């Protein structure tokens, strides 16, 4: 009946809160933005790095569910901020887990991991299933791999109720800049608004990612909390690989001016996973989840968001 | 040739320093205690958690080799100090790597990892080789798995010269208390000296570990520095599994007096790897290394160290 979402003012957070409120769940959300407000959410000021405040907030609210979304979410920025990505993602998670363990709460925690935990996938391994070797290629990936490992250990050592996800690329209106669909859509609309030369600036167009709309993601998170098996890991993904080139092409075909493409070398990463496509069989079998929103719709709605801003 | 050993005043460090000085390597060593001192080592005061002081030391010395041993080495203690084990092992390592990166030094770094990175190994996987998946069971294991992943990433992203070890249990005279062969030997000699009732307090006797004498370990580290392949991971182990029961029985057979055995529940860990036995084939093939000192001899010399004060 009672859910706590850390990082509720983030991209996924707002959609998740909306989704839970519609399932008649009482929603509490935490953020560092002491002015942030969300419809039907009790908002709580919390820095996930303040271990004693994490333990106070969780002790006060006594949630039945925690969806732990507070994190440094950028792969790109983890190269520059390796330690900060690790302190926030690993230690923030530990503070949450230790709060529950200490309060001895009857609570299920969903920890949010990443397809970056897999990293380099052997061609024979794709689409990747949950038993696949973890070979992270980015510092972010190392942080999420550590979160997952600790999740499993807390289940084993302390009898806790934790489910870890490995979420693949998630997209939709409201995602911050620094992520590919936002970075591209934003330039396109600026070009339409004659605020930028008709030339779009891009990074690596050869990468392949598995994209799912944030609205489908939060349904999967809800369903996992309800039907998932304690201590299991679940891929949350569409099972379809799209080249970044084709994400760009889909977006450009929706623009109402002709647009040239140009390499921006500051968008390249020191090392990157060339391809990530996941198997969602475990998730589908456990929950009856299916993605519903096609990539084309997601991308169009992102363009619409910038256009109406 | 100049070598820098971090954590030089630790168990492995003192032996490694002695070994390197015998190879006509100029040895510089770091420790947090300013009242240390080692034959033929230039001692430097350094806390590995001080990123700017780490850079300064590495900038000053301009070493050809760094043997990075500074760490929180206890698996037992990692359950109580999860964040400290993480900050020291992962961030300490990042400080070293970034210092070398910044100074653009022509330097090979040996990062020291652990069989705890493997964790739970399937019977068909034993003895484990370096491509086995990582399924750590202890927070310590997560910290070392992260060190290894990051070492591989710095090679790939930045073109650095780094070799990572996965070292299995290492033993010998001078190891601190809190590790099994020391905890057992100390009590036996205290019992011989009539300082303790003839009952030894012990933890889990059913665990299996792969033991190698520290004098052999440091030869492996030296040889890897010379002959190892950049970006490769090497198990450093004997390939022989010994039950802790049998470790104890070997020690009791060497004692003066009949000694009974009793469980001390405080020696039990929340969750533990039942069995770790490694393949040393990659190391032997690359370097010609072989373990020379039998387990019985290591255990004997440990007892002698307590008996001789
Ligand atoms: N020290 C912290 N204490 C409390 N919250 C923190 C702290 N550091 C960061 N966050 C928050 O986490 C939220 C993460 O949201 P987004 O960056 O928009 O990511 P998204 O909602 O797409 O991803 C949610 C989860 O899904 C994963 O992909 C990602 O790593 C994360 O675990 C942000 O609002 C971010 O908030 P802020 O914008 O830094 O104030
Ligand atoms: N923040 C720190 N800054 C500088 N040094 C540090 C810091 N934290 C710990 N150390 C040192 O690392 C040394 C590690 O030595 P032992 O605990 O005796 O471990 P051992 O020498 O058996 O193992 C060497 C390597 O092999 C692995 O077993 C272990 O994780 C480590 O990576 C200790 O002298 C330990 O010294 P101290 O007793 O904690 O002062
Ligand atoms: N951001 C960005 N990415 C670009 C650009 N050009 C090409 N790309 C490429 O587009 C791909 C997706 O990058 P991002 O959208 O930044 O996300 P990510 O690095 O894959 O990480 C996202 O997905 C993970 C799940 O796999 C999430 O765990 C993570 O938090 C994030 O949402 C990457 O291969 C990136 O190099 C650009 O201009 N901007
Ligand atoms: N310390 C200790 N261990 C005991 C005792 N009784 C049983 N044990 C068991 O003896 C085994 C060895 O434990 P330790 O000597 O504490 O070492 P460890 O946890 O295996 O870790 C050591 O080896 C790793 C390499 O695999 C190293 O990475 C790590 O730094 C450390 O040296 C474990 O299964 C432990 O539970 C006891 O009284 N004391």
Swiss-Prot record, chains A, B:
Any GO molecular function: oxidoreductase activity
Domain of life per record: Bacteria
Top enzyme category: oxidoreductase
EC number: 1.1.1.281
Sorted UniProt keywords: NAD, NADP, Oxidoreductase
Function: Reductase that catalyzes the conversion of GDP-6-deoxy-D-mannose to GDP-4-dehydro-6-deoxy-D-mannose (GDP-D-rhamnose).
Family: Belongs to the NAD(P)-dependent epimerase/dehydratase family. GDP-6-deoxy-D-mannose reductase subfamily.
Protein name: GDP-6-deoxy-D-mannose reductase
Organismal lineage: Bacteria, Bacillati, Bacillota, Bacilli, Bacillales
Gene: rmd
